[PDB]
Design a protein around this ligand. Sequence first.
Ligand SMILES: Nc1ccn([C@H]2C[C@H](O)[C@@H](COP(=O)(O)OP(=O)(O)OP(=O)(O)O)O2)c(=O)n1
Ligand SMILES: Nc1ccn([C@H]2C[C@H](O)[C@@H](COP(=O)(O)OP(=O)(O)OP(=O)(O)O)O2)c(=O)n1
Ligand SMILES: [Mg+2]
Length: 579
Amino acid sequence: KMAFTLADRVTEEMLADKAALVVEVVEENYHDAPIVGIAVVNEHGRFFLRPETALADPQFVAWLGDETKKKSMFDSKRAAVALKWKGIELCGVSFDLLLAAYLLDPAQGVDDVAAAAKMKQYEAVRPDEAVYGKGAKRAVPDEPVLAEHLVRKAAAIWELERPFLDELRRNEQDRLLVELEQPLSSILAEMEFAGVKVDTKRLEQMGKELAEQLGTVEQRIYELAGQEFNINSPKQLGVILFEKLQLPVLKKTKTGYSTSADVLEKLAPYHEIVENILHYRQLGKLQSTYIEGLLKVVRPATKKVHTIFNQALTQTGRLSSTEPNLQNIPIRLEEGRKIRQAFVPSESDWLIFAADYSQIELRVLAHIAEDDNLMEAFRRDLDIHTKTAMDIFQVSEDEVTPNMRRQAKAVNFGIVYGISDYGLAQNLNISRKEAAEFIERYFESFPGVKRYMENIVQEAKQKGYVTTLLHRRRYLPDITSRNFNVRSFAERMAMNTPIQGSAADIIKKAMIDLNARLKEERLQAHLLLQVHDELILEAPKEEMERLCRLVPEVMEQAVTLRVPLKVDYHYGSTWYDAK
DNA sequence: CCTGACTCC
DNA sequence: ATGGGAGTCAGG
Ligand SMILES: Nc1ccn([C@H]2C[C@H](O)[C@@H](COP(=O)(O)OP(=O)(O)OP(=O)(O)O)O2)c(=O)n1
Ligand SMILES: Nc1ccn([C@H]2C[C@H](O)[C@@H](COP(=O)(O)OP(=O)(O)OP(=O)(O)O)O2)c(=O)n1
Ligand SMILES: [Mg+2]
């Protein structure tokens, strides 16, 4: 039973200095998406406004953009970006219920106001999907039904703010929300709306050449197989490998023979065709995802792509990137890495600038574990990825290739995060006995890491959750399970989540600090992407010198640990050349 | 619609 | 049974 005004025009009482605000965008991808309705709840009452009315009203636009007029919202980034596409600036967001719910418990997967409301037994609001429908049936409902929904969402935010803030405070997470996540949200909104420019001429030419290449590789595979088949079907491929060619079956899953890359690599001594197939599947992913998939989402008039950074999704505090994912662009193989040549500055005589934290989760672990040897390694500015490489490959520091260092990187993180002898052995294609002895020596080098991992598992059993440096939390209710697999996975989340999450806390803080410095120094430079422990910027070529000092400094000083933080940086004419 | 493939941190 | 965190794709 909820009264509200379906307003025909904006009135002064709608423009109070505190309000719950709903700016509704139904489409999952909110870039250039319709705003279908607006709701405002404040001390004076409850109001629904039509966007064509409200958004062309100069007082309402003024109010949206006035930082002293405070708004509580759910997913303020979605509203901010949708408004930027409407040419309107949103300021003064003081509470975001999505971010509040996320910090209280990321496992709730809260994706609408109703699911957040449930956390406090508030039920005077419906789920979005129940209002709009799903798939081909998704639609905006009749105005009265829409209006009531948006108003109930705003009223929920109005009533839920204090109970959420109260609980965050009890958890010592209120500052994490107000000083970190909420300011980051506005920064991500800027990055997403800016977008990254793409060289479509180059990408399309790449794609044409790649198609010819796939054809050649495909026919070679059919020749080796003695038959045509769909190489992109693990079922058909399994029949070829394990029935026609009679190769050993190393692994099965629930649907049939495994053809994972791990398995095919191990079959190379039996038939050369597995190497061709691995190459083919790489090339096919390049074409489907990083050529075709990317071209499909380029906005043609500006040649820009606009990702969405999901800030309330991952269980550790990382961001994710969708439609397109710009956090998994190829780099490890030169063939794939060339895609990066198609990511270019948005203005002429600008350049791309990239900065990456050195050995980040190993520095974080040194600090949190207080491992004397590892802490001293970072004080000696050593490279643990390179050192591990020299060992596993029996090679000098000068003969270690970037590829070797990449592999050693997975060995280091594998070991500290609980890899077994079976897994390490399968990884380095070495003897299981050899792998076990290697793990043993690793923890004899870093015994504090070992103690830390034993202890954090016990603490997680006792408390039911683990925490990061800035008080981010993950609950682990499975960790005392009688079941071995269920318990074991939970134990390994206790080992990993605090470290990966603390690293996420750090780069989030650096983005805030960096933008503040950019503004203070009046630089045109701005952030384009975050890639977990990297920041990618564009700026006039004349700003590179400054950035070379400023960016790494801000990143390195974002937090003070018991070890130095270190940042590598590069710049060039394209994302590829920023190395 | 899921599974298993390739991509990154 | 067998490091952890992610997203997109073709095939079925
Ligand atoms: N009410 C609070 C207090 C702290 N924090 C988060 C953000 C802070 O940046 C981080 C660190 O807190 P402090 O700097 O105040 O140090 P603490 O006293 O909390 O010690 P510790 O972090 O070891 O628990 O914790 C928070 O979100 N809300
Ligand atoms: N196989 C991997 C690779 C990375 N990561 C995590 C831990 C890494 O510290 C972090 C960053 O990825 P990087 O590739 O940037 O690795 P580093 O920062 O550790 O090393 P560097 O930047 O010096 O190459 O992501 C991981 O858990 N497992
Ligand atoms: Mg790094």
